[PDB]
Write a protein that binds this DNA or RNA. Structure first.
Ligand SMILES: [Mg+2]
Ligand SMILES: [Mg+2]
Ligand SMILES: [Mg+2]
Ligand SMILES: [Mg+2]
Ligand SMILES: [Mg+2]
Ligand SMILES: [Mg+2]
Ligand SMILES: [Mg+2]
Ligand SMILES: [Mg+2]
Ligand SMILES: [Mg+2]
Ligand SMILES: [Mg+2]
Ligand SMILES: [Mg+2]
Ligand SMILES: [Mg+2]
Ligand SMILES: [Mg+2]
Ligand SMILES: [Mg+2]
Ligand SMILES: [Mg+2]
Ligand SMILES: [Mg+2]
Ligand SMILES: [Mg+2]
Ligand SMILES: [Mg+2]
Ligand SMILES: [Mg+2]
Ligand SMILES: [Mg+2]
Ligand SMILES: [Mg+2]
Ligand SMILES: [Mg+2]
Ligand SMILES: [Mg+2]
Ligand SMILES: [Mg+2]
Ligand SMILES: [Mg+2]
Ligand SMILES: [Mg+2]
Ligand SMILES: [Mg+2]
Ligand SMILES: [Mg+2]
Ligand SMILES: [Mg+2]
Ligand SMILES: [Mg+2]
Ligand SMILES: [Mg+2]
Ligand SMILES: [Mg+2]
Ligand SMILES: [Mg+2]
Ligand SMILES: [Mg+2]
Ligand SMILES: [Mg+2]
Ligand SMILES: [Mg+2]
Ligand SMILES: [Mg+2]
Ligand SMILES: [Mg+2]
Ligand SMILES: [Mg+2]
Ligand SMILES: [Mg+2]
Ligand SMILES: [Mg+2]
Ligand SMILES: [Mg+2]
Ligand SMILES: [Mg+2]
Ligand SMILES: [Mg+2]
Ligand SMILES: [Mg+2]
Ligand SMILES: [Mg+2]
Ligand SMILES: [Mg+2]
Ligand SMILES: [Mg+2]
Ligand SMILES: [Mg+2]
Ligand SMILES: [Mg+2]
Ligand SMILES: [Mg+2]
Ligand SMILES: [Mg+2]
Ligand SMILES: [Mg+2]
Ligand SMILES: [Mg+2]
Ligand SMILES: [Mg+2]
Ligand SMILES: [Mg+2]
Ligand SMILES: [Mg+2]
Ligand SMILES: [Mg+2]
Ligand SMILES: [Mg+2]
Ligand SMILES: [Mg+2]
Ligand SMILES: [Mg+2]
Ligand SMILES: [Mg+2]
Ligand SMILES: [Mg+2]
Ligand SMILES: [Mg+2]
Ligand SMILES: [Mg+2]
Ligand SMILES: [Mg+2]
Ligand SMILES: [Mg+2]
Ligand SMILES: [Mg+2]
Ligand SMILES: [Mg+2]
Ligand SMILES: [Mg+2]
Ligand SMILES: [Mg+2]
Lengths: 195, 59, 134, 117, 110
RNA sequence: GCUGGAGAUACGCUUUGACUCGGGGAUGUCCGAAUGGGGAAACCCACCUCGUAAGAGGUAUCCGCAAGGAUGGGAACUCAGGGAACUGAAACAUCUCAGUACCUGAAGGAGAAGAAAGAGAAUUCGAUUCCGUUAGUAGCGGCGAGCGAACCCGGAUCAGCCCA
RNA sequence: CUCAGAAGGUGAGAGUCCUGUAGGCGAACGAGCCUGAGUAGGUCGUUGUUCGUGAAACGAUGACUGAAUCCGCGCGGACCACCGCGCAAGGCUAAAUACUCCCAGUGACCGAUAGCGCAUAGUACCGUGAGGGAAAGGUGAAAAGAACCCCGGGAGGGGAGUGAAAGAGAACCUGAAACCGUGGACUUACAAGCAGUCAUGGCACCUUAUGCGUGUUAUGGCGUGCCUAUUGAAGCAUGAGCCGGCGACUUAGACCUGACGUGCGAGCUUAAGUUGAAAAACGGAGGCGGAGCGAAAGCGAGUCCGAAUAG
């Protein structure tokens, strides 16, 4: 709604800001899902005698003077199989798109209520060299005391990236609620496709 | 279920369950009273809680 | 701030841990355990006791178009043959029938597979027509 | 992810065990026999609490007439004449004055003696 | 069981090279390399060394007593420093002869 | 630098390029499909040919004229010949478990399947397999327990070539 | 410095010490007139698919028979007519599908009762055999792994020495509990007891700590383990020698039905898949509301039973 770019105003920024200020509830629903979906389901557990190794029968039921149990592969046995252990699950599902759209809107708007940066003509990087990135950021008020999320096209401008800290490259709007919210501030650079 | 399909236990608009009438049906009728032609549609919802999940795609 | 991100305030509770003093030792007391038989049970179930033969069939069934939808509200814009989108028929692949519900005097032209004669009464009596395929 | 029982049980157990101190033999040293006995102790604590009240009452009383009868009265008589005079609401732990302050309790006796008969 | 195989079991320096103690005791002492063991590291240099009581049982003499011997070392110390310094010298070069490669940093050869 | 884990003394070998590689070769005792014959595997006894002994080569059956091909071994996967019961139906015969388990045979890195005497009800589609869906829908059933499609549509991949 | 900030090693946590990483290059030898007859068709015995003999079509064979050639033939779920769809009795065929001995990468997977049975072992051990089948870890930064002296045959320990540490010494990280002891404090040899609890006295102590104190003890009052199973348990009814560790209400599905919450709301939402992945968009096939009544044809704010109206 209010932003001045690197090449000078792009015709102005308006877009929209889903008032009241963002929402934490709807936000956290998204990131929860986000991390949940990206979660890799994996588990090691041995069930019982099919999955463990034992076989057969044991000392026989009545009249041994000791306890009843007929096998060694059972949960109640040390070295045995396991009951109700974890199996290779999924943890994935489709968050309604309406919310996924609404999520980063809110999140972009979360950077707007605070410090927000958009850019055109960031050519000062001078190929890559990674150093002029440090300068370009420094001239733009980016200390390095904040963690920044750079999102853009023009891979050269991205090819300078990944500083000692704080610099994270996110190519051509693969932008998600998580990454932009976890960072201190965000630079969406190119306003194109941010139309 | 497949049991109540061509059978009784019809659901309605309100979701209530429709029962037919049994005695007597195709045999052992004889006697006198109207009552033969008086076995129609009927219902109770007391048992019907357990009849919904038995066949609900249709009414 | 990611760490500042809050709950939903009563989106949902945790499950039930049945291992403890205070709330455990559960299921029934006797014969409620190790289960998996259940559903409905007895001597001779009501179901079997109850008569029917009847039928199945279910041949042609029609998409209903409520008449109040056309007339009055919107423009009474002459929905024509396929309005589809912005109109209420969706799944289709089934014939469509037009039935009288709401009414006003405004002209209409409706192409449907059939319609009620008491609806088709009010279609012309407001001006306009309903046509059917050959 | 497994979560083993580690470092939880041991702390709780030791937490119990430490409650048990002058506990004789197995009572002090091994948890199971230590845990219970605290079960029963609960019964002995809660109940004895409102009981020591009962005990003491009968202790004060037991003193009072011992002193009263020394003067030719008794708890029943004394407590009454002291009651029959709205004057003395004395009541609670009157035994203190009975045992410790002999000259005092006497004047307290004759007051009860007089305002009764 | 792992053991020193973390580096690619390629050795910097060589059999005879002169070199500085990096970190450790001493630290900046020098010596010619006596023994180089690529697999296990274990640089033997003329620097820091420990008094070894030799095993009492012996075929020659009751003996024992205490030899000085050696203390072997890791890649913990430096490599072959030319430019009057303890410099760690990355670059190789095809220079001088068209055969050998001489590691230098601010400088040449080694 | 090296002289296997081996850790230990000795003899050493290596810029004439070792060692550690990456890739071809060369030797590869005896047993094992074993296959000269025998046979309680890894040992006993032979015949033929080249020959100076040392030693090398051959000697099983099965298809064929021959070249040549087949025996045997595979973790799970595929197809085929054969084919359970406990269990469920609150007992039990039809039924269910289930064409599951097991057995046997064949084969490959996949296999099976395939080029409409088809699906079907638009005078529509257009080899096969696979996924989603149709759909717990049609139906099957001591019409009990319970079993349960396909066509349309959306996808993955899409080739048809030859003989009497 | 950064096209390199992934990572592991180094006396303790390194971007710039090592190996690496981004990036770049790289081999001789390698490896990627016809048109299918003992058959279609049939009867008998049967079976497949939703097909349990049912009105049972059609496929498929075991046994008997046994056709037509294009002015032909098979199907369309008994059968007939019409109408359609298709040419059997010859074969072959990549691709999308399955699995994981084996290699790689990653992990809201394990970390020595876990994880494979095995931190290597199908070994030890058991069985004539088929077969079954273990426990398993840690000096140190480096062996610098203790020359030498003392008691002892030794084992074992006390020194010395090395080391930051030997409060690491090879029965070598931590080292809880049961269990065994040594020394001390207050106690105990006329006393009937689920082992406690309460009150007071005595002695001792003084680092959340000179009080509402900690430890112990004498005396008085009170006082029927625990769990399970039961109308009812201290029960002479079940279970348990003790302490440690292992150990039991889970997961799954486009399933059903409720509650809370959220986003869109006369609408709501995608599945498989495609594309891109340091992240997600795409994908309307389909699904759910939207009209009910009837056995069904069907009709429709109506429907159904019936000649109506009574329901
Ligand atoms: Mg016993
Ligand atoms: Mg295990
Ligand atoms: Mg109905
Ligand atoms: Mg749960
Ligand atoms: Mg509760
Ligand atoms: Mg019980
Ligand atoms: Mg009972
Ligand atoms: Mg039971
Ligand atoms: Mg069970
Ligand atoms: Mg059931
Ligand atoms: Mg863990
Ligand atoms: Mg008590
Ligand atoms: Mg009282
Ligand atoms: Mg009183
Ligand atoms: Mg070695
Ligand atoms: Mg080498
Ligand atoms: Mg042989
Ligand atoms: Mg043989
Ligand atoms: Mg041969
Ligand atoms: Mg096999
Ligand atoms: Mg049976
Ligand atoms: Mg049964
Ligand atoms: Mg049977
Ligand atoms: Mg097989
Ligand atoms: Mg073979
Ligand atoms: Mg399917
Ligand atoms: Mg398709
Ligand atoms: Mg095609
Ligand atoms: Mg590091
Ligand atoms: Mg520094
Ligand atoms: Mg033909
Ligand atoms: Mg035939
Ligand atoms: Mg037949
Ligand atoms: Mg039958
Ligand atoms: Mg047939
Ligand atoms: Mg003809
Ligand atoms: Mg026919
Ligand atoms: Mg027909
Ligand atoms: Mg293939
Ligand atoms: Mg283990
Ligand atoms: Mg252990
Ligand atoms: Mg095993
Ligand atoms: Mg074995
Ligand atoms: Mg033996
Ligand atoms: Mg070591
Ligand atoms: Mg020892
Ligand atoms: Mg000794
Ligand atoms: Mg010690
Ligand atoms: Mg220690
Ligand atoms: Mg020893
Ligand atoms: Mg350590
Ligand atoms: Mg230890
Ligand atoms: Mg003593
Ligand atoms: Mg003692
Ligand atoms: Mg005595
Ligand atoms: Mg005594
Ligand atoms: Mg006693
Ligand atoms: Mg007292
Ligand atoms: Mg003191
Ligand atoms: Mg006592
Ligand atoms: Mg219990
Ligand atoms: Mg009883
Ligand atoms: Mg009792
Ligand atoms: Mg008992
Ligand atoms: Mg009993
Ligand atoms: Mg016993
Ligand atoms: Mg399900
Ligand atoms: Mg659903
Ligand atoms: Mg499915
Ligand atoms: Mg709701
Ligand atoms: Mg809205």
């Amino acid at each position: 709604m209010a932003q001045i770019n690197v090449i000078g105003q792009n015709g102005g920024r308006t877009i929209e800001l889903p008032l009241p200020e963002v929402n934490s509830g709807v936000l956290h629903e998204v990131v929860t899902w986000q991390l949940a979906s990206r979660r890799r389901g994996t588990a090691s557990t041995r069930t019982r005698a099919q999955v463990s190794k034992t076989g057969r029968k044991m000392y026989g039921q009545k009249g041994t003077g000791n306890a009843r149990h007929g096998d060694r592969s059972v949960p109640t046995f040390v070295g045995g199989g396991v009951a109700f252990g974890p199996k290779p699950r999924s943890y994935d599902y489709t968050l309604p798109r309406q919310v996924r759209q609404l999520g980063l809107a809110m999140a972009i708007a979360s950077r707007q209520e605070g410090g927000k940066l958009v850019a055109v003509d960031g050519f000062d990087i001078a190929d890559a060299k990674t150093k002029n990135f440090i300068s370009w950021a420094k001239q733009n008020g980016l200390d390095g005391t904040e963690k920044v999320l750079l999102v853009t096209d023009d891979e050269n401008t991205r090819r300078a990236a990944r500083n000692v800290s704080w610099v994270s490259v996110l190519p051509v709007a693969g932008v998600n609620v998580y990454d932009i919210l976890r960072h201190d501030r965000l630079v969406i650079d190119a306003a194109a496709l941010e139309i | 279920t497949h049991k109540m399909a061509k059978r009784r236990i019809k659901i309605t608009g309100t979701g209530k369950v429709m029962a037919f009438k049994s005695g007597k049906r195709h045999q052992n009728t004889g006697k006198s009273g109207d009552e033969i032609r008086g076995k129609g549609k009927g219902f109770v919802l007391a048992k019907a809680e357990w009849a919904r999940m038995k066949l609900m795609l249709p009414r | 701030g990611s760490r500042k991100d809050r709950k939903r305030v009563g989106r949902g509770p945790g499950g039930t841990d049945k291992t403890a003093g205070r709330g455990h030792k559960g299921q029934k007391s006797r014969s409620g355990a190790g289960k998996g038989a259940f559903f409905e049970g007895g001597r001779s179930r009501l179901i079997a006791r109850l008569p029917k033969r009847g039928f199945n069939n279910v041949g042609t069934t029609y998409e209903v178009v409520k008449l109040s939808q056309l007339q009055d509200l919107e423009d009474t814009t002459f929905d024509r043959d396929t309005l589809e989108a912005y109109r209420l028929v969706r799944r289709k692949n089934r014939p469509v029938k037009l039935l009288a519900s709401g009414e006003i005097s405004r002209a209409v032209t409706v192409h449907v597979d059939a319609a009620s004669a008491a609806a088709i009464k009010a279609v012309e009596a407001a001006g306009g027509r309903v046509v059917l395929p050959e | 992810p497994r979560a083993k029982t580690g470092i939880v049980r041991r702390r709780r157990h030791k937490k119990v065990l430490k409650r048990a101190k002058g506990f004789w033999g197995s009572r002090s040293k091994q948890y199971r026999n230590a845990f219970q006995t605290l079960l029963n102790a609960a019964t002995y604590e809660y109940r004895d609490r409102r009981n020591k009240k009962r005990d003491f009452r009968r202790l004060w009383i037991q003193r009072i007439n011992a002193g009263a009868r020394l003067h030719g009265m008794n708890y029943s008589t004394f407590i009454n004449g002291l009651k029959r005079a709205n004057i003395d609401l004395n009541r609670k732990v009157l035994a203190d004055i009975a045992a410790r302050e002999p000259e005092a309790f006497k004047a307290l006796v004759d007051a009860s003696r007089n305002a009764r008969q | 069981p792992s053991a020193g195989s973390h580096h690619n079991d390629k050795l910097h320096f060589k059999k005879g090279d002169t070199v500085i103690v990096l970190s450790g005791k001493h630290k900046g002492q020098t010596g010619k390399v006596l023994l180089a063991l690529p697999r296990d590291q274990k640089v033997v240099v003329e620097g820091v060394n420990v008094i070894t009581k030799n095993v009492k049982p012996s075929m020659t003499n009751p003996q024992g007593g205490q030899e000085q011997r050696e203390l072997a070392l890791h890649a913990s110390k430096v490599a072959l420093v030319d430019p009057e310094t303890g410099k760690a010298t990355r670059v190789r070069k095809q220079i001088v002869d068209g055969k050998k490669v001489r590691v230098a940093v601010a400088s040449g050869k080694t």
